[PDB]
Ligand binder design. Structure first.
Ligand SMILES: Cc1cc2nc3c(=O)[nH]c(=O)nc-3n(C[C@H](O)[C@H](O)[C@H](O)COP(=O)(O)OP(=O)(O)OC[C@H]3O[C@@H](n4cnc5c(N)ncnc54)[C@H](O)[C@@H]3O)c2cc1C
Lengths: 488, 488, 488, 487
């Protein structure tokens, strides 16, 4: 057990005034990791007033002064990488082999990226005529709010807070109630790095209360949300109805992986595995519809079975473990229901499909890596995001067909193609309706690369130079040096 | 009167299948200008399918081919300026002295600007390592919808359709039911210029039906809305609940005009007049809170009274007319309610405050130019947007005070300062919470200059290079040329 | 015969005061096309004072006013395309099948592109602290000079004058003494479109006199030169000694075409043909070193010989003619000297190598399409730019080798690769030391694409957005609103 | 000090020239150090070293390069005082300046560019469904910087920072007057993790070492700071040799325009800072001060009062704010100009002679000097002096002063002092100078591009554009459609 976790407001831990708490569980054992205070409406208002005061100090500093502070936080994150990863593993159930190599490393990469860009944030100047010109300022939005998801807690906290802070804002961050612990550690790290009090406040709580209070508050200028497609629609509605906030949404997907007829099937199988079974399949960008040519389908299935047989579930801190439990028992129940739907709708179960049992598994929400084949576009498992380790294999005959079927979805997050052919790779990718496209790979998300969804998978983008800009608002200023003429 | 006005879908006028119609009234006479068909749910679906087909043809053309077609539309608009202006005056009540000099001229200015920028729309390329790089595409959103307001009907239709079309999209445009006529002429003009069938469709109708059907349609990727704060909040909510659409909102304001202690009061009075009584006060950016130093208030009031006396209401086609009726009789009733509110709360009526009477006015929706003084920050006329010819004059003592009071509003659209002092002009403007700021002038909105609101006055921007980009969506593409490594 | 050609200064033809003239020869017949006046030192001084006056009028116009004038020049160039192409064919010897399809079409494409970009030319704004900010202006250089080459006379005149004019400068253009005629026609076209007098002046003359006088003039702010590597080095030196002018240089190359081991040899042969024998080999970007894998060399040679046999020399105005004489008889003598060196140094002559003979050829400066094989890196024909129809075929064994040999040159203009493999194409191209790189094609130069040389092949770039910016100069302006502190 | 060597490939190495030169302490006349001079063979060795290091450097990730330059920034901040004392010994500038400006703003620029490395991006241009273009911003390769003597280490950092950040190696030739801090910077870069060969330093004289750099066939770009005459030679020899890209930051005769509504205390402070900082050895100095006739007398009085507070003395004393000139030959040239001002009829307001007495007789001191009643034809008004010599000129109306401010072959900087919104922007927009200050002088933020119009320069330094200018664009067309040959 850990000590009781409090709110983080204005550079210090503080008790919530809500009188409410919740528990976060270790998904591998079921033990209570901590009791956590839940922010109420009054706590949210305190956090906003704290953020308004800190934002003014932060914005008044020089650009390089802000850069240096964020870089100090990067340095602390690098030093504490392994410790934070262990905490993330306890809170999420993801293997340490993942968390120590990806979660903090790539979160800190984005913070480090934006820290260096702060001095490059510039407005524009537009000559109109000798006697008048326009210039623009990219001004901070003010106080912004981030709402996190549970699959990559500290990485999401860093990907939202880095551009927000770098753009001169304060952010109030609400982590998922499933995984609140690393966000609180990040808040301390920022303060240690010299971030002014109030610039990064963290309010654990449940979505129906703490999250809603943030989306309704009249002095928060922008909401950035990561989570499911459904929950996203609700947040975006409430943010508009209350105070017309700017919005960013990073939602789920049903992303297609297209294997071309000229692909090497070992490479294609390796990409499909990494696109489906990393983080136990709990990744928004996963390539969960795998399109394979009919002539290669049988051989591809064999190569998938061989690789799935290698997956190593077990002790999450052991080096050779590469597969974990799902984050919770309710989430596994939902994944199990999708698996049962696949069976009842006539998809062929290639492997997996059941809970794991026995010593070391009975206390966690483990599901075996699962692969369905003989899938068709009308099946529930093919149409809906599962957010578990469930691959759907679909046969196709020609390039025009596969593009059509890949695009025939309300989702739009990611896509990829496996082919050695120059023309085929670019030609196919240019026609796919997704924001994140991978050629002969999957999953890499460089700090420089803007990422987000088409269609129901998102609004706006994260990462890249454009996301620094999107956390500012443009003010246009006309200087009229000629004599003003009134017609009255 | 005109013949029953039909919908415009796929390069031709077509009858609505809704069985519903509405009337547009000439606000100068009360007569019916035309009966207009209202697009039904099935009509909207037809328009979307038409737009999808046209967008594909349009996007497949070269960038310069798109530029030439928009440039031909510009040429037709310049040629037909006077004819279109006369129709706009009939539909809106704005004097021909305005519509023939501003509405089409500045609408076409924006179309001409975006036509030339089409070839400069570029993605990026990012080296990761010798064996991998990223490039981005700025892809069309697809089909977008624009929903217009009634104060600048054809100008709004051009400011929305120009960046949308230039970015490679098709737009379905719903004009205000108050002023539907010039949008239909624009649709014909675009087709005459060579715009492919379906790329610009126009669907008259009422907001609760035709507008909502557009905000709900699953195949429309973005909604751009101009109108009131209230209706915007509804539009943004329904667009989210339906299909998670990207959104732009240009709403109203209560913009402050700050007269500095060193301002020339003849200039300040001229700016205040142009910021309040152009288009009979029906301009979202109007500077309807005029802050004047206490020591200058009496002299400024005298200068305003003098200039108000020069306003020339009359025949909207007469050369010397520079003031018109309001857009509709229901709108006049709301403006009269605000005026009575000002009287009942004790604001001092300096001039106006009643309808115009006599030959040539009894049949039009005329409100006299009205000025209230001795106003305070809590009065209803000071807090709420009136959208009529009602100036509120507020006394103030010092610079810090006036900046706070200017900013103490949920609105955020525009602001201005009158001062000959270098430091004062930039110092004050940099502290105002508004997207559109004028120094020693008011109202000019160059095609190059991004415009839109802070806080409740808007989401996103129009005009400028940034708005061409905001009608595209970013696709990031990673080319991995090294061997892909799976951990399984 | 044509009338004596005069200088074009300040919107009209005017007599030179040098007392000197020169003749331009029709390379198909040896006849004198025209006597042309040569601008002397005083004529250059007159042209600069004219340009100084016109530049002020031009820069004082609005951006869109300049845009519209250049667009009118585009419209005239489209209408007169065939007439201008016929004159270019008479002056250069290039077939009408080329000049009517490329020279004016792509020249006007660049003018049309930059006309549309004028309003997007913007400076920057940089906040330093609450009390100080910087903004930048992109100001015209003033009077700039362009010095053209003889292979693409009017295209070069357009590619230099379009960005210079669009950026607000006046340009004095000196066409090659070999090909002066179409530049004078362009000057008339600009005046007809509304270009202010003095903004585009044309001074025919010889390089040692008129060209040098321009490079030395103290009131010319920039020189843009297209021509041979040697003459460029001299122009750049003389510009520095005089008044430290900005410089752009587009010089020749010895560009490599790399045929990969997996290439289709018909495609490779087609690309090699277009890279060597268009415009009778007089293209700076030609792929005159063709690297072929040893295993495919014999077959590649056979495919080249088959296509060379199809080349159709003849009447330059006939539709089926696709090969012309060289631009002048002295240039033919130099090409023949290079061919003789190839023979004497042991390269194997596969075809051509002599003048064309018989009726319709004896009086023109014809050289047969020539192909050498078994070439080695030390041969004169492999190391030096020939600027005639002479392909050198070189065998190679592995990818590392061909990259090294492709790069082992002082030239750096263009390069290309023929391969269907995704990784091979990007991997190889990323390692080549050239500014213009083509994958599975050759020769296309879109207006959007910056083009220029590495190493000895050039300084700066033409086309693209960057070249518009390179015809402005940055002024940085700091506004200090805080109290200035002196240490004295 | 010990005899100073070349720095090639991460180590000090003896020169192969057999030649050396001396750097003099301008405060005492003593020899500070004997310095080895790089010969033509040393330059070729430096280039081959740089070619090797650049490939290692460019192959690293962008953030790996960023981190290494940031470590160099951290070392520079820690050793600010040590480097500043060395700079003061070599240049004669007061420690009060070198410890506050030279390294601080040098490191500021390095720190700025370190953060921008990951933002360096090419473009992508769709042509049609079957073809697109993308561009790469590739390193130039090996570039050379040739420095001036007034801000030795700052110039070394302002040239090397964008060059290194863009993925190039730089060979740096410091001025022979002031070679010492550049060698220190080379050690700091290596300590920070910079690959061997990426920053090589070759001391030597301009006529030999500098010329050998401009002539070398494998150097892709030259960045030069110095005088117009040497610049014309550099740019010519760079073209004649191998057609190198060239950037030049030359001198100026920058005008300071005092408006009719200016506060004269503010104007006098700006004129003082624009003329007597670094003993007047600043390229951007506002050495033509235009004052309205109606205020001329009062302005002169305010200038004289501020000149009287100038504190020449021990360059390591806290209150010292004025030093000797960088060298004794430079002083004779400055005295030549001062005597020209006297003989052409300018009125001497103060100064005009060397400083004398204990502690000054052995240093290259020139007193702060002010001329008034100046006219546009005078030599001191037309030519850059690069010493502490202010020229005051009267004017009557705004159009006149703008014409006269612009009537020069120089174009580096300019400024206006006025509280009026319209006057400040209106006048500045009409001045033909690259660096313009309103109600201030001298501040040169890392973000702000700076360089000259007309004879004052080619290209710019600082800002995002200068990072880009140390790359070359490669355009790449991908044709996915079938290629059509007409043959
Ligand atoms: C049954 C019915 C009949 C009506 N008949 C008429 C009539 O005959 N004449 C008339 O002038 N008005 C009519 N209205 C509309 C009414 O006057 C509203 O006040 C309407 O909002 C006025 O639109 P506006 O453009 O003035 O203002 P705003 O409400 O600001 O409208 C701005 C724009 O948004 C659109 N809009 C408004 N609400 C929505 C929404 N919920 N979803 C999408 N788009 C929306 C408007 O149509 C317009 O294009 C009718 C409404 C209903 C429900």
């Amino acid at each position: 057990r850990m000590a009781e976790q409090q709110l983080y407001i204005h550079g210090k831990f503080v008790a919530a005034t809500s009188g409410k708490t919740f528990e976060t569980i270790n998904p591998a054992t079921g033990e209570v990791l901590a009791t956590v205070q839940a922010a109420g409406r009054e706590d949210v208002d305190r956090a906003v007033k704290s953020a308004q005061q800190g934002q003014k100090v932060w914005a008044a500093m020089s650009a390089m002064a802000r850069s240096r502070i964020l870089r100090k936080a990067v340095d602390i994150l690098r030093e504490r990488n392994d410790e934070l990863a262990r905490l993330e593993t306890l809170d999420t159930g993801k293997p340490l082999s993942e968390t120590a190599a990806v979660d903090i490393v790539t979160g800190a990469d984005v913070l480090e990226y934006y820290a260096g860009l702060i001095p490059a944030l510039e407005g524009s100047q537009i000559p109109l005529r000798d006697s008048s010109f326009v210039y623009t300022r990219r001004e901070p939005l003010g106080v912004v709010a981030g709402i996190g998801a549970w699959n990559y807690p500290i990485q999401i906290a860093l990907w939202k807070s880095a551009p927000a802070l770098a753009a001169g804002n304060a952010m109030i961050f609400k982590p998922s109630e499933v995984t609140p612990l690393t966000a609180l550690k990040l808040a301390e790290i920022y303060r240690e790095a010299g971030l002014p009090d109030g610039v990064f406040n963290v309010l654990p709580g449940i979505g129906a209360e703490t999250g809603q209070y943030l989306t309704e508050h009249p002095d928060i200028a922008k909401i950035s949300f990561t989570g499911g497609v459904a929950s996203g629609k609700k947040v975006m509605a409430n943010s508009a109805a209350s105070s017309l906030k700017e919005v960013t949404m990073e939602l789920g997907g049903k992303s297609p992986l297209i294997i071309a007829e000229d692909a090497n099937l070992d490479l294609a199988a390796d990409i499909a595995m990494m696109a489906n079974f990393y983080s136990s399949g709990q990744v928004c960008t996963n390539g969960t519809r795998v399109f394979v040519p009919a002539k290669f389908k049988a051989e591809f299935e064999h190569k998938i079975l061989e690789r799935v047989g290698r997956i190593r579930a077990g002790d999450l801190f052991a080096d050779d473990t590469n597969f974990g439990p799902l984050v919770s028992f309710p989430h596994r129940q939902n994944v199990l229901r999708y698996i049962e739907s696949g069976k009842s709708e006539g998809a062929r179960l290639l492997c997996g499909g059941d809970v794991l049992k026995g010593e070391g598994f009975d206390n966690g929400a483990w599901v075996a890596p699962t692969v369905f084949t003989d899938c068709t576009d009308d099946m529930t498992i093919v149409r809906e995001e599962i957010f578990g380790p469930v691959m759907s294999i679909l046969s196709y005959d020609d390039e025009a067909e596969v593009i059509r079927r890949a695009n025939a979805t309300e989702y739009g997050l990611a896509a990829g193609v496996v082919t050695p052919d120059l023309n085929r790779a670019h030609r196919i990718i240019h026609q796919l309706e997704a924001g994140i496209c991978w050629i002969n790979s999957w999953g890499e998300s460089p700090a420089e690369m803007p990422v987000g969804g088409y269609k129901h998978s998102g609004i706006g983008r994260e990462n890249g130079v454009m996301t620094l800009q999107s956390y500012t608002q443009v003010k246009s200023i006309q200087v009229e040096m000629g004599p003003f003429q009134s017609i009255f």
